[PDB]
Structure 1
Amino acid sequence: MKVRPSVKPICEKCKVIKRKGKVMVICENPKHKQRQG
């Protein structure tokens, strides 16, 4: 997990969902997981 003001995708696989009024990016590679953009 990495928390940053800017959350953008890094690979073809990564996808951008929204949980509980926050924008995150789930993805296969656990290094790509990010939150709160």
Structure 2
Amino acid sequence: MKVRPSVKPICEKCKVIKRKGKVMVICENPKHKQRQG
């Protein structure tokens, strides 16, 4: 998990969602998972 103020898609399969009022992304490879903070 990367925690950075700038969250962006790195994949072409990466997806942006909101959970509990926080922006995140999710790909199958766990390196690309991020959340805003």
What TM-score, normalized by structure 2, do the two folds share? 0.91
Structure 1: runs of 5 or more not aligned: none
CA RMSD of aligned residues (A): 1.0
Structure 1 vs Structure 2: percent identity of aligned residues?
Answer: 100
Structure 1 or 2: larger strand share?
2
Q: How far apart are 1:36 and its partner, in Å?
A: 1.2
Question: Deviation above 4 Å: which 4+ runs of structure 1?
Answer: none
CA offset digits 1:1-37 (Å, max 9, x no partner) = 0100000000111000000000000111100000016
Q: Which runs of 5+ in 2 are unaligned?
A: none
How many positions carry a matched residue from both structures? 37
**TM-score where L is the length of structure 1:** 0.91
